[PDB]
Write an enzyme that holds these catalytic residues in place. Structure first.
Site, PDB file in Angstrom:
ATOM      1  N   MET A 234       0.805  -1.186   0.000  1.00  0.00           N
ATOM      2  CA  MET A 234       0.000   0.000   0.000  1.00  0.00           C
ATOM      3  C   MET A 234       0.851   1.253   0.000  1.00  0.00           C
ATOM      4  O   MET A 234       2.015   1.216   0.335  1.00  0.00           O
ATOM      5  CB  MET A 234      -0.936  -0.034   1.196  1.00  0.00           C
ATOM      6  CG  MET A 234      -1.709  -1.312   1.307  1.00  0.00           C
ATOM      7  SD  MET A 234      -2.886  -1.340   2.623  1.00  0.00           S
ATOM      8  CE  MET A 234      -3.712   0.173   2.303  1.00  0.00           C
ATOM      9  N   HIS A 235       0.252   2.355  -0.423  1.00  0.00           N
ATOM     10  CA  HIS A 235       0.795   3.690  -0.233  1.00  0.00           C
ATOM     11  C   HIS A 235       1.977   4.159  -1.075  1.00  0.00           C
ATOM     12  O   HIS A 235       2.410   5.287  -0.949  1.00  0.00           O
ATOM     13  CB  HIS A 235       1.203   3.941   1.213  1.00  0.00           C
ATOM     14  CG  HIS A 235       0.205   3.449   2.206  1.00  0.00           C
ATOM     15  ND1 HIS A 235      -1.106   3.853   2.195  1.00  0.00           N
ATOM     16  CD2 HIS A 235       0.319   2.568   3.223  1.00  0.00           C
ATOM     17  CE1 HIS A 235      -1.757   3.247   3.168  1.00  0.00           C
ATOM     18  NE2 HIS A 235      -0.916   2.459   3.802  1.00  0.00           N
TER      19      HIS A 235
ATOM     20  N   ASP B  80      -2.549  -5.094   0.158  1.00  0.00           N
ATOM     21  CA  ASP B  80      -2.209  -6.292   0.936  1.00  0.00           C
ATOM     22  C   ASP B  80      -3.097  -6.631   2.142  1.00  0.00           C
ATOM     23  O   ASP B  80      -3.577  -7.762   2.246  1.00  0.00           O
ATOM     24  CB  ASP B  80      -0.724  -6.288   1.351  1.00  0.00           C
ATOM     25  CG  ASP B  80      -0.281  -4.983   1.985  1.00  0.00           C
ATOM     26  OD1 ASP B  80      -1.133  -4.279   2.581  1.00  0.00           O
ATOM     27  OD2 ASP B  80       0.935  -4.676   1.900  1.00  0.00           O
TER      28      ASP B  80
END
EC number: 2.7.1.17
Lengths: 472, 476
Positions: free
Chosen positions: A77-78, A233
């Site tokens: 993520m991110h 995830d």
């Protein structure tokens, strides 16, 4: 047959699910990280692709993917991936663990006072939004060339289908999504000099986002199979493990103690250790808290008392004398062990009991902080390595007053949730209830009313005790 | 030859000393405590006698007590033994560690303001005077009968000699004694509505107060030998070790931690936790303070850590990671200590914890002594004894922390019993001096403070004190 791809940080894992949800094959390809300066954590997008493409070709080489019907992806993520108008990668990707833009975090939040309300989160450096604020300030020339900003998993979608899409779970992790409305937040984008034109299109995790480019299809030995949105995830992680409906929750004990819980509608508590996000399924949201650090935390105390196995202090913990010291271990959380000393004048298996209960109280409060947001599970699936002691499991039950259903499995990872989401999109007929099983029940722990009632006051340590004491 | 008796709280110990002053034999017999209501610590004056008697016979079965010329006695302090005119026990003895009279303490100090001045101490429920004020309140019927009030060893004396006597060091711990004048305080007595007639006769610990009654001498196989006044376990123990003149001090690191120092005159530091009492010697006073047992902390820590012997602990302490952050072990004294371990990280293992303990205990003891010195006490070097002082690394850490030279001497294994026998030798050989009669224990080793290590510990002591005072509340 179905394919599931997970773009992790250490590497990419690709799986093959047979028509009945079982994992027929798997392939993993290592991935390195680049740390150009202190606090920097970057990756070359072309390395994600090369790894994926190797994994796939390695998978189909074992068994022909000529029968795969759908494919799903999940990823770290991110991570910010800046692409130019011709889909070319401007600079390396700035990952979830990159902490160079802390200052841009303050800026953004000052720019949109209602930021925490919108995203439901506190603006952190790993989040996508503030990184672009950083690139604009430190690499104006690269910022000017921005056409599209994609998350890791989604950049991979681009290479496979030529499409620009993301799912709500991963999108929310950018701090540009209005988590409630499940749509891009204009106020947020604007505060970063970005517009919907630069964001990918939004899909629910189980929705189809495109097909495999014929080339790719041929390079992997499969048809122009449809590709679902998927999830980040965590969310795709829960999906593959059956953590989908409201008030369902799980704890993983861990190289992180993470509490993940499906909520009814959008809930949030910014000023806390609680993170809020959209789930990888329609009209579903989730909250989660990281915790200990009941593997670290527990090895430490096992060596501290001359023991070397965690199994040992659990055993030792067991013969503690009902001498009630009682002990009182405070853990802290880097991580490091704000590690509050104690109280005592007795033994090693007595201290082993203190440590195990200290962790237990810390966990109980962690889950209670989550629950007090608007979640109330009837039970809590418990999975992971740090959860093999029936004794410690039963202690967590008596301490928290939560029914803890222990379950085996849960080792595949997000990849399994990516293939499951693909099954859903391929079987519009079957109901979710049919495509999303859970890990096989291994035991169920109900709180002993006796110990439970005695503990609630005991937890009145992680009351005035943990609080009078920091000063760390 | 000489006998000493120690009426402890748990045992009684009798030793046989040769004309030289060396131990020839020794015997012990156990006692138990009654603990009826909470804060109540009681004992049977009769259990003392049976225990004492059994031991003397047991000592006799070992060696012949026919050549014993004099007998001394020492005992647990402050215990309160109530007797009627027929010399009968009105009720169990309220020991030193009984606490039913906390109220009566305040009331006494309110009735007698100069009280801390007269007794030179802070009224504590373990002291004798408040206990009697208690009996008068709750058991007034038992109080109407009190003919005599005796300390544990003195009750023992009455049974051995038919004499009602005590020594100044033990009588001092009643709070009925004007410690500066070495005589009872009518003021203090009237307050408890008691009178001198209910108190025994006062003697310097080295003075003879009677002799073993024939049948006692008989059963124990000895002559009707003279019996000295003796002293409280502390003062007596100090005489044994040789603590006799102004500015002589010793630190006992046994199961019972005590810092004892012979003062220059009567020093009064009441508001402190420093106690001022008459010595068991003529014209001698002292100060004493309760301390940790090192050698109970060192054992406890050696096991918490899985290290199984105290020399392993001390070795481990020495292998600690010079890079690991400081760990603070705060020892709170109530061998009951309660302890706190502040500042523990992933980097901290058994070796680092070992070292935190030695330092914490050491820092605690250095502060204990400092409190007593600021009182007037000026020891050049301090005598160090006990089992907690066996390790040389640790004698030196402690010297370095304290900044005090520490002369480690052998033979505080014996206890107050050696003192008792010593006081007896003094009475038996009136022409001899104390120089010859109270030697100091053999010098095992002298630890001079290392200037560098001293300066190094100095800021760490300061941080230990702040941290200690900061959790103090969370304590009791």
């Amino acid at each position: 047959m179905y394919i599931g791809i997970d773009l992790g940080t250490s590497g990419v894992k690709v799986i093959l699910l047979n028509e009945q949800g079982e994992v027929v094959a798997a392939q993993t390809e290592k991935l390195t990280v680049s740390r150009p300066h202190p606090l920097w954590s970057e990756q070359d997008p072309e390395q994600w692709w090369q790894a994926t493409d190797r994994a796939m070709k390695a998978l189909g080489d074992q068994h022909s993917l000529q029968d795969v019907k759908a494919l799903g992806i999940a990823g770290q993520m991110h991570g910010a991936t800046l692409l130019d108008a011709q889909q070319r990668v401007l600079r390396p990707a700035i990952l979830w663990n990159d902490g160079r833009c802390a200052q841009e975090c303050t800026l953004l939040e000052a720019r949109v006072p209602q930021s925490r309300v919108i995203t439901g989160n506190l603006m952190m450096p790993g989040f996508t939004a503030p990184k672009l604020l950083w690139v604009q300030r430190h690499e104006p020339e690269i910022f000017r060339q921005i056409d599209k900003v994609l998350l890791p998993k989604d950049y991979l979608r681009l290479r496979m289908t030529g499409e620009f899409a993301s799912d709500m779970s991963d999108a929310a992790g950018t701090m540009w999504l209005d988590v409630a409305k499940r749509d891009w937040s204009d106020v947020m984008l604007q505060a970063c000099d970005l517009s919907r034109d630069q964001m990918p299109a939004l899909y629910e995790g189980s929705e189809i986002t495109g097909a495999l480019l014929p080339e790719v299809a041929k390079a992997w030995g499969m048809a122009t199979v449809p590709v679902v949105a998927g999830g980040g995830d965590n969310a795709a992680g829960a999906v593959g493990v059956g953590m989908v409906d409201a008030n369902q929750a799980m704890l993983s004990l861990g190289t992180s103690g993470v509490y993940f819980a499906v909520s009814e509608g959008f809930l949030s508590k910014p000023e806390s250790a609680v993170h809020s996000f959209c789930h990888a399924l329609p009209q579903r949201w989730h909250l989660m808290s990281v915790m200990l650090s009941a593997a670290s935390c527990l090895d430490w105390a096992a060596k501290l008392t001359g023991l070397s196995n965690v199994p040992a202090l659990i055993a030792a913990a067991q013969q503690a004398d009902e001498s009630a010291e009682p002990v009182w271990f405070l853990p802290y959380l880097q991580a490091k062990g704000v590690f509050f000393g104690l109280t005592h004048q007795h033994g090693p298996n007595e201290l082993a009991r203190a440590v195990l209960e200290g962790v237990g109280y810390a966990l109980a409060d962690g889950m209670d902080v989550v629950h007090a947001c608007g979640i109330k599970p009837q039970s809590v699936t418990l999975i992971g390595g740090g959860a093999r002691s029936e004794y410690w499991r039963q202690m967590l039950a008596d301490i928290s007053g939560q029914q803890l259903d222990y379950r085996t499995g849960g080792d595949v990872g997000p990849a399994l949730g990516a293939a499951r989401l693909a099954q859903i999109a391929a079987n519009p007929e079957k109901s979710l209830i049919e495509l999303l099983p859970q890990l096989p029940l291994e035991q169920s722990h109900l709180p002993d009313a006796q110990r439970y009632a005695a503990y609630q006051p005991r937890r009145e340590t992680f009351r005035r005790l943990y609080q009078q004491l920091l000063p760390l």
